[PDB]
Design a protein around this nucleic acid. Sequence first.
RNA 1: GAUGUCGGCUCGUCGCAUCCUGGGGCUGAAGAAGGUCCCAAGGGUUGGGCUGUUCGCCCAUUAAAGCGGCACGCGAGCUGGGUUCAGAACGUCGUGAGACAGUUCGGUCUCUAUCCGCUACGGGCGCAGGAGAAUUGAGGGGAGUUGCUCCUAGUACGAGAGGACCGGAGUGAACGGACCGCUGGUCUCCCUGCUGUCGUACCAACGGCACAUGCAGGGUAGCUAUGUCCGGAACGGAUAACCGCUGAAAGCAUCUAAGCGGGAAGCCAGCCCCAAGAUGAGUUCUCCCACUGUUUAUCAGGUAAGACUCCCGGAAGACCACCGGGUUAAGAGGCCAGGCGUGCACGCAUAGCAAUGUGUUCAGCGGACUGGUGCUCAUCAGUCGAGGUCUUGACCA
RNA 2: AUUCCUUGUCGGGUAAGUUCCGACCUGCACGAAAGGCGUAACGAUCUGGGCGCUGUCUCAACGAGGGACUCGGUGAAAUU
RNA 3: AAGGAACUUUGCAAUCUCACCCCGUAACUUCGGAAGAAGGGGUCCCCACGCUUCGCGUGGGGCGCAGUGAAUAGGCCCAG
Lengths: 113, 205, 134, 108, 58
Amino acid sequence: HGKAGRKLNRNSSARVALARAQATALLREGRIQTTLTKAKELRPFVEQLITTAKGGDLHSRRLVAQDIHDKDVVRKVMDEVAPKYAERPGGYTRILRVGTRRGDGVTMALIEL
Amino acid sequence: MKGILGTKIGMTQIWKNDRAIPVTVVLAGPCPIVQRKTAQTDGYEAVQIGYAPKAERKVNKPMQGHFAKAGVAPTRILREFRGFAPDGDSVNVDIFAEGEKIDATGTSKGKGTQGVMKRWNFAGGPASHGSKKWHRRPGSIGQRKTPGRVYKGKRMAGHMGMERVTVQNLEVVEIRAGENLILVKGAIPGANGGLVVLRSAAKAS
Amino acid sequence: MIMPQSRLDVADNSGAREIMCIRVLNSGIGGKGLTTGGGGNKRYAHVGDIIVASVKDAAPRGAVKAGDVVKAVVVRTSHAIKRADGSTIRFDRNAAVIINNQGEPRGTRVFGPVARELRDRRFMKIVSLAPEVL
Amino acid sequence: QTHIKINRGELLRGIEQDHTRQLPDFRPGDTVRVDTKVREGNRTRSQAFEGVVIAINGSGSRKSFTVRKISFGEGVERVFPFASPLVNQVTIVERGKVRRAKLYYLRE
Amino acid sequence: AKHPVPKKKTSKSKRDMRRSHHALTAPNLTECPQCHGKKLSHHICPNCGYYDGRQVLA
RNA sequence: GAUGUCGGCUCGUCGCAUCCUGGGGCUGAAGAAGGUCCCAAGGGUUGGGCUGUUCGCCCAUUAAAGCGGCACGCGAGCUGGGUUCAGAACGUCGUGAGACAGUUCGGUCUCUAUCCGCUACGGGCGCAGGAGAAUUGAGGGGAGUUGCUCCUAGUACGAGAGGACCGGAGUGAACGGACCGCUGGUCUCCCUGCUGUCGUACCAACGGCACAUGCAGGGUAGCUAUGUCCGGAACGGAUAACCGCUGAAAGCAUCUAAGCGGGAAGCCAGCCCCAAGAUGAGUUCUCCCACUGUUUAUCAGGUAAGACUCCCGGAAGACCACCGGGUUAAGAGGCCAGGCGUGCACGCAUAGCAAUGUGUUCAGCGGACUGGUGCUCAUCAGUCGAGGUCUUGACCA
RNA sequence: AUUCCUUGUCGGGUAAGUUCCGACCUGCACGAAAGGCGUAACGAUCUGGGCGCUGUCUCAACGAGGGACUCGGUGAAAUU
RNA sequence: AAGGAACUUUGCAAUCUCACCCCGUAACUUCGGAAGAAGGGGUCCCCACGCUUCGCGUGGGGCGCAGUGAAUAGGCCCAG
Ligand SMILES: CC[C@H]1OC(=O)[C@H](C)[C@@H](OC(=O)N2C=CC[C@@H]2c2ccc(NC(C)=O)cc2)[C@H](C)[C@@H](O[C@@H]2O[C@H](C)C[C@H](N(C)C)[C@H]2O)[C@](C)(OC)C[C@@H](C)C(=O)[C@H](C)[C@H]2NC(=O)O[C@@]21C
Ligand SMILES: [Mg+2]
Ligand SMILES: [Mg+2]
Ligand SMILES: [Mg+2]
Ligand SMILES: [Mg+2]
Ligand SMILES: [Mg+2]
Ligand SMILES: [Mg+2]
Ligand SMILES: [Mg+2]
Ligand SMILES: [Mg+2]
Ligand SMILES: [Mg+2]
Ligand SMILES: [Mg+2]
Ligand SMILES: [Mg+2]
Ligand SMILES: [Mg+2]
């Protein structure tokens, strides 16, 4: 059959780049408009980065630095965002569905922190 | 004849004497008697039993009445067991006994569309000596001009699994009533957390 | 799991050094000697199974010589053998011991350890000369 | 399929516990594993398998360990269910220094 | 040439018969609670940009 | 104005003039082993060496290694070894160009299925109201093989050597179904190690690239066989050849002309699966209840019971369908704890000139596993869906 | 690369060898510049064997990517 | 996994081999060859000393399953 669990519409290398790229964008911007699916897939990965950063020690930073290649974003996540989510029992990131696009007819969506 | 509804829990390793036994842990929970079917009213002799409890809100008026007429409290599953009567409300205690050969039936894990190789056994073809028809692809579907038809029943690719399967003469290894559990030697069809139907051996050896 | 064409080590001083499977039989052993086959199919030889084989290499001087068509019982396998308690045995190299039509070895000695399954399969004499029975 | 509110984990853990045995610490490095050979006729014999632990696998009932040893010039690997009745007691013979969890390279 | 090919033109009937399942399904449009310009269920109202509060610009 | 041709493979199905099993009669049938004929097509009928081979010979087995049909079954299914194109050589023939009864090396097998047929899956309408469930089985399909060993019993039988029927146990082989606990396989980024180079200022620590995993080691869920579990039956009813009972024609005799019983792996039933489009559309339980609308709107419109649409998912799945959850909420994600996998993290300290080693640290990391928990989204809503035809008969106040 | 009878006959190799090597001679129908016989080296030649290795195979499984399936956009064909 | 040509017309296809240094190397021959025959071993990091340098040699030590640590990269042999 196919009872696995994850997505991949590209190849290993790329599936990672995308997740890391959208993870960097959401943390840079605070909210990003993307395809509904790409947004559904992004949600767990960014939520996981917030928890790693919630450590607040060097090891926790360097672990974020593995997926967040932008130096300024890693500082923002580490010193600004994770602290704010201290008492949030890791949940925050929400998805809003906008509606169908022109060229491909794809339903767009929002993903905000 | 005798029978129960349950949920396949899983498979583990057990020992009886020095021999290791592959067991299928089954929850043959309490089964309320919901309808008795007689030759006088239903034209045949049978019993309607029920299995998993349903939240009252989730149950509709037609099912509410049917459950109320027996004073049961909504199940979710309802199955009939022919030529079975015993009074009260069905549990595995004295229904089954350690050593009894039983016929556990479930619904095979469905494997969607499957080629003639996986589904029918087939043979496919050469991987190398010049193909186009490498591995799966059936052969010749028929003959030539005579039966201008392809035989009805022809083994071809289709939806494999998600079917009724009765596995015969499975041994009863352990029974923990009150824990509402029954251990069976071997493998029962269907996936974990699925509906199983444990019945007294269809035609015991 | 031994099938025709499988070359295997000889665990005896019968003369042969390597035998190559020609046929896997349904390994008889009852009164009259070895019993007649339990079918014509039968895919693989396991430990305790009887195979017909061609002698691919023998030592100079010894009862069995190269090219001779012989019967041997499988005594070791790289393919794992399962037991009633749930334990498993597996040997680095597969091996056999040349037998006669009586099921008794052709050599005076057995080399390396042998599978306990040979004992259940009623191969006393083989088990008897075996240095260890695992 | 039947949507019963169940913790299958514990139902399973429940059964498995009356069929699970704890043995000495052992991670790799040598072990005399003294097993009992009940099958030698009606008589109960005693054998001892001693060698390096190459793998440890599973948990609960299913938990096992693999022992490798060279016996009479030929390599032998034996796999034991910790809770097997034919196993009497395992004993650490000498603790080993290893950089991984599987040791299969020792086969060459 | 072009290996399997159709044997006869398919009649005006036959052709239209397979077309019986092509008819599009109109959206299930709902009235918006705070600008009333119709919206899709579970989507942000295109006109006011609300989804309980105002989520999007314009 | 084209019906592709040997052999292989793939896939089957059919006949019986039966190769094996099953039942019988005769035997120059003591027994065991057979010979021959009758009934019997349910299943079964092995792997190799040689040849393009069909065949055949051989090896090694077997219960057996059946014969034939299906365009010498099957190339819009595959091969292309044989043969029948162009090249080239040999032997032969022809003065020659060339030729063959030949032989030899080489030599383009065409992505898209319209109808019928076949496998799987829906949508529609029907089944005299609208609904939610549970079903009977007309019919259909699947399955159907067989060895060895022991017991009976070293008995019957035979002078012996040898050696049973009948009945009863086991245990395999092949095949099938299911399953993933076990042994294993895989597991494309879950963990580790390694190289070159480029980058995050440098060091340290990381990241890309080397595959569509750079390479290596291992590996959970899932899927999987080569791994497990179960299966072919028993009982029965009617029969075949065949064996009998009562029994005339034909004072006797005869299984047959009246009637009767027995009797096969075959037939019908039993086992497993589908099945009321079984338009002959069946049965049972439960629910909702008999709205409203001008001789302008001729039956539409609010509705009930109930469902659908949409969202979030799924051991369900191409789509659709099927199952669950949708705040009255534990559905998925997260988050927490645990399992399990990898195998001792960064950073600091110490030891050494150093490469490294040791402690901190059974560490650190973390896909899919088992629970918990209202942090995130399952918001808000819209669409649809009865008011039950007539005739005859029985009961009813 | 010539042999019809032909799978000639004996030997080798193989468990088993219509091919292959070796003899033999009965050359249907070899033979001396339409060159005869041999020859080290060379060959994307052709033939037979061995070791190694392997999914060619028993017997197939899992995994990946691009198509196939679904929606939006554009939209052919032989054939009839 | 186990097996290893049992596939087949035919190991077709795909593996295996794969660079540089040291050792080593057959029949046969036209004395060049055959030859990269065949087969074996080395290969990373540090430190000390020696030396013709980018380096290399001896010695001791270190780490991993594995050191042309990834990429480029002969499978070989017998006979016709
Ligand atoms: C690749 C596409 C091209 O088709 C082709 O080449 C394929 C390979 C050819 O197939 C064939 O030869 N075979 C197919 C079956 C057997 C035969 C064949 C026979 C022996 C061998 N032997 C070995 C050992 O190999 C190989 C093949 C085609 C189909 C030829 O048709 C066959 O003709 C035979 C004479 C009569 C056949 N029937 C009627 C019985 C008929 O099928 C032919 C002549 O084209 C060559 C048709 C005309 C119409 C064209 O010319 C079209 C336009 C082509 N032109 C273009 O470019 O497209 C094409 C379609
Ligand atoms: Mg195949
Ligand atoms: Mg394992
Ligand atoms: Mg022809
Ligand atoms: Mg055809
Ligand atoms: Mg596994
Ligand atoms: Mg790997
Ligand atoms: Mg009868
Ligand atoms: Mg719902
Ligand atoms: Mg969870
Ligand atoms: Mg040239
Ligand atoms: Mg389109
Ligand atoms: Mg010569």
